[PDB]
Design a protein around this ligand. Structure first.
Ligand SMILES: N[C@@H](CCC(=O)N[C@@H](CS)C(=O)NCC(=O)O)C(=O)O
Ligand SMILES: N[C@@H](CCC(=O)N[C@@H](CS)C(=O)NCC(=O)O)C(=O)O
Lengths: 206, 205
């Protein structure tokens, strides 16, 4: 019977991954969404000067992926064997590589930063998309099941599909050409607890 | 359990796995691949990249996933679920640091054209000044000589090895951080590590 507090900004972003993992498992936690007002005071008190942070009975854990994995293993959403857990880690790291291409160009694409959206799409987004999506889809085809690894949902599934779904809003036809991913995203987000959470969670830009 | 690590001749991302094996005294095929063989292998890999670890025939990709898998197998991952997550956390912070530098490696090394001085002042030195204190802070809270717990973990082995390599490419890379240097020495003092460091193929990186 452990007590959980997640500290992140109002947006979904990196924090949403943890939230999704809680709601899937049906585990209650404090969704501490932090006001911009309070960030300057908290920042120097954090391990690395950033959020998200997970508090577990007082103890602090930083870095989102470490948070995802910790929650995943605690809730049996990490894989049924040691090699499976690794395969889960593996596919998410590849997703992380993909994100490493896109995220630095997010704000120009969202319009928050001055720049040539059309250029970025052709010179950064669409090439990244074209390289990485086939690799995620290939991996997904190993399984034959509806998930990247195993016959049931894992934490990597929850975080990946949510992020891809959101990026579909910034980039038209982002998933066009990859229906196996489109189904995969449709499936995970139709899971009852996820489906519920998506309906109730705050509407934020990203 | 037959262990086979596939990577290129250089240390790079593959070295992390090698260090974890040697520290645990576990035997493995250190398969270092010729450039000549990369075009044929690449399409037959999960993500088109190395390193790969295969154990009894099954292939595992992505270096960090390889580090953690091996570390957990050899009791080098942490002593509790929270300690394990903490090992992941400090290493993820370390990857963020590397994410700043690694894209600038080839210019700093001279494999690609560019102003080395400008890169140092505008990217390398800033990245260093932001991140080293964070690593040093995390190490300082530990009390022990390692990032987490009282014994060495896979994150210690990969971090210290990587930090040691970057001394070369960045002037005074660890100048104002006596704690980090001592920690790098200590982890690399460990018998199996000191041994492997001496035996391993002399590559620059
Ligand atoms: N590698 C970190 C990245 C965390 C991160 O970049 N957080 C941003 C928000 S997405 C942040 O805290 N910005 C405020 C700041 O850095 O001062 C992780 O995965 O958790
Ligand atoms: N995210 C991957 C990165 C692996 C990677 O970038 N490998 C490079 C060498 S360091 C490679 O395979 N280059 C050959 C190629 O991609 O075709 C990991 O951590 O394992």
């Amino acid at each position: 019977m452990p007590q959980y507090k997640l500290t992140y900004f109002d947006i979904r972003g990196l924090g949403e991954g943890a939230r999704l993992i809680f709601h899937q498992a049906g585990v209650k936690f404090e969704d501490n969404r932090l006001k911009r007002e309070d960030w300057p005071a908290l920042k120097p008190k954090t391990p690395f000067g950033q959020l998200p942070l997970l508090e577990v009975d007082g103890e602090v854990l930083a870095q989102s992926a470490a948070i995802y994995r910790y929650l995943g293993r605690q809730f049996g959403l990490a894989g049924k064997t040691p090699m499976e857990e690794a395969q889960v880690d593996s596919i998410f790291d590849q997703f992380k590589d993909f994100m490493a291409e896109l995220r630095p160009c997010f704000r120009v694409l969202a319009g928050f930063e001055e720049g040539d959206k059309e250029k970025v799409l052709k010179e950064v987004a669409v090439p990244a998309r074209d390289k990485h999506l086939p690799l995620l889809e290939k991996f997904l085809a190993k399984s034959g099941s509806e998930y990247m690894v195993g016959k049931s949902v894992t934490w990597a599934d929850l975080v990946i599909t949510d992020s891809l779904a959101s990026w579909e809003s910034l980039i038209p036809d982002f998933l066009s050409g990859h229906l196996q991913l489109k189904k995969y995203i449709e499936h995970v987000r139709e899971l009852p607890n996820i489906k519920k959470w998506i309906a109730e969670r705050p509407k934020t830009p990203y």
